[PDB]
Amino acid sequence: NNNRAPKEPTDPVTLIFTDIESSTALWAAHPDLMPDAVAAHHRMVRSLIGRYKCYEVKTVGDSFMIASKSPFAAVQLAQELQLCFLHHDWGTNALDDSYREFEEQRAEGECEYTPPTAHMDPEVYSRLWNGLRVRVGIHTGLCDIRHDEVTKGYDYYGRTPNMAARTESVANGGQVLMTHAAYMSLSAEDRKQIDVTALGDVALRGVSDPVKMYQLNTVPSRNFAALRLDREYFD
Amino acid sequence: NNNRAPKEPTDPVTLIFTDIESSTALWAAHPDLMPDAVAAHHRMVRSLIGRYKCYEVKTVGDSFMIASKSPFAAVQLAQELQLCFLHHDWGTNALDDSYREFEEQRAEGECEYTPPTAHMDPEVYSRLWNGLRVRVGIHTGLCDIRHDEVTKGYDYYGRTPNMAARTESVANGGQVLMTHAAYMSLSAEDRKQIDVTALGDVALRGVSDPVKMYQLNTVPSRNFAALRLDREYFD
Numbered sequence A, B: 001n002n003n004r005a006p007k008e009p010t011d012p013v014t015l016i017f018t019d020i021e022s023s024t025a026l027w028a029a030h031p032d033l034m035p036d037a038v039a040a041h042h043r044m045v046r047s048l049i050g051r052y053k054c055y056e057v058k059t060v061g062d063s064f065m066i067a068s069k070s071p072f073a074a075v076q077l078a079q080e081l082q083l084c085f086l087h088h089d090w091g092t093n094a095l096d097d098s099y100r101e102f103e104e105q106r107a108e109g110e111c112e113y114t115p116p117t118a119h120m121d122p123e124v125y126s127r128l129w130n131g132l133r134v135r136v137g138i139h140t141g142l143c144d145i146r147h148d149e150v151t152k153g154y155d156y157y158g159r160t161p162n163m164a165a166r167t168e169s170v171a172n173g174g175q176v177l178m179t180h181a182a183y184m185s186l187s188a189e190d191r192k193q194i195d196v197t198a199l200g201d202v203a204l205r206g207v208s209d210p211v212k213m214y215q216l217n218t219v220p221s222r223n224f225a226a227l228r229l230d231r232e233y234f235d
Helices: A023-029 A034-051 A071-087 A094-109 A122-128 A159-169 A180-185 A188-192 B023-029 B034-051 B071-087 B094-109 B122-128 B159-169 B180-185 B188-192
Strands: A013-020 A055-060 A063-068 A134-141 A144-147 A154-157 A176-179 A196-202 A211-216 B013-020 B055-060 B063-068 B134-141 B144-147 B154-157 B176-179 B196-202 B211-216
Touching: A013 A023, A013 A034, A013 A071, A013 A159, A023 A094, A034 A055, A034 A063, A034 A071, A055 A154, A063 A071, A063 A154, A071 A134, A071 A176, A071 A180, A071 A188, A071 A211, A071 B180, A071 B196, A122 B180, A134 A159, A134 A180, A154 A159, A159 A176, A159 A211, A176 A180, A180 A211, B013 B023, B013 B034, B013 B071, B013 B159, B023 B094, B034 B055, B034 B063, B034 B071, B055 B154, B063 B071, B063 B154, B071 B134, B071 B176, B071 B180, B071 B188, B071 B211, B134 B159, B134 B180, B154 B159, B159 B176, B159 B211, B176 B180, B180 B211
Parallel strands: A134 A176, B134 B176
Antiparallel strands: A013 A063, A013 A134, A055 A063, A144 A154, A176 A211, A196 A211, B013 B063, B013 B134, B055 B063, B144 B154, B176 B211, B196 B211
C-alpha cells in the first residue's frame, strides 16, 4: 500500500522511529522468549500502522521507521503503541523482572539515578508497566523523498529522518518524545486532545542546534529517568 | 446495606454514573409512558446493584451514582444493564420511534453525522436496540469518602467522581465508557473476559488533561456516533 506513503516533497513528513530498549540484553537473557515476543511486537505495531493509515518505511531488527502524511495520526499511533503493549499478555514476567534488575544495578553507577519502576508495589507497577518497553521519537519536516532502491517502496532522507531518529535514541523505554516541530505541526484542536510535558532542549549528536523535546504522556502516571544522552541511533 | 459501600480511603473506588439519553425530550413526548418506563429502569438498575454487590450512592431523576469495591463488578453491572434493558419488554415502540426520529433530524445539522440506527431494517434494529437508551461512564480512583450528611449513607468527593461523571456525560445512549484508569484497575484475567474498543483521548471540561476512553462492548455489533462533547454532567 504505497498509497499511504507521503510522496509530495513540499508537504512535511512526520517520521516515527521505535526500538525495544535493552534488546541486546534481553535476547542474551531470554533467547527462548524473544522470538515470540518480538514477533508479537511487530504484529501490534503493524496493526497500528494500518489503523492509522501510516506507512512502514522499513524495519531493521526490532527498529521500525514509519512515515505519516498526518502529524496527528503519527501521534495517535505512538500513544496506542504504548497502550496496547501495556495491555498485551506477554505470557511471562521475565522481561519485567529483567528491566527492574537493570534499573537497580544502574542505580550503583549513576548516583543521580533512582530506579523509576523497580521498587513499585506490584499493584502500582502492573497498571503502568508490562512487557517490552519501546522507545519512540517523532519529528515532522520536509524530506528528500525517493522511490524504490529495488523494493518498489518509498524512503526518506536528510535532516528530517536524522532528527527523528536521534530524538528517538535519547528516549527511555516506554517514553514517546516529539520535537517541537512535530508538536506545532498538529492543529490547535489536535493539541487539546493530547497531554505533553516539556523537557526543554537537548543537544543531539550530529544536529547543529539543541532540540526542544516534548514528552507525550500516553500511559497515565508513567514517569522516567533522565534522557539517555548516551545513545545508539538508526543507521 | 452500607456494608457494600467502599469505605477505606486508601483503596480506589470504582464509580458508575448513568443517565437516560434525551430524558427531557422523552418526558415531553411521552408523559403517560415515562413514569412507568423510568420506574422499570430503576427496578432493573437496583436489581443489578444488588446482584453485583455494589452500592447505590444516590439517584437524582433518572441519573444513578453507584460505587463498587471491585472494578470488575462495576464493569459487569454496566454490561448487564445494557443487556437487560435490551431484553426488557417496554410495552411500546414509541420510545424507539422517538430516538430514531431524533437521529434523522440531527443528520440535518451535523453533516459529519449519519444516523446509527434510524435506518436499520427492523430485524437488525430489534437485535441491537430497544427502549430507553442509557449512557454509562465508569472510572476508578482514590476518593474523599464521607459518611451521612443526614442520610446515614456514604458519599464520594473529589476528582474521582468528577471524572466519572464527566466521562459518562460524553457517552451516547446505549454506550458504556470506561477511563483507562478503570480498564487497568481490572486484573489481566478480568480484561480477557471483556471486549473494549479504544477511543483515544478526550478533552473533558473541568479536567486538566485529556482522558483516554475505552468503549465497553456490551450488546454485540452495536455502533455509535461520535462522543457528545457538548454535555450535561451530574451536579
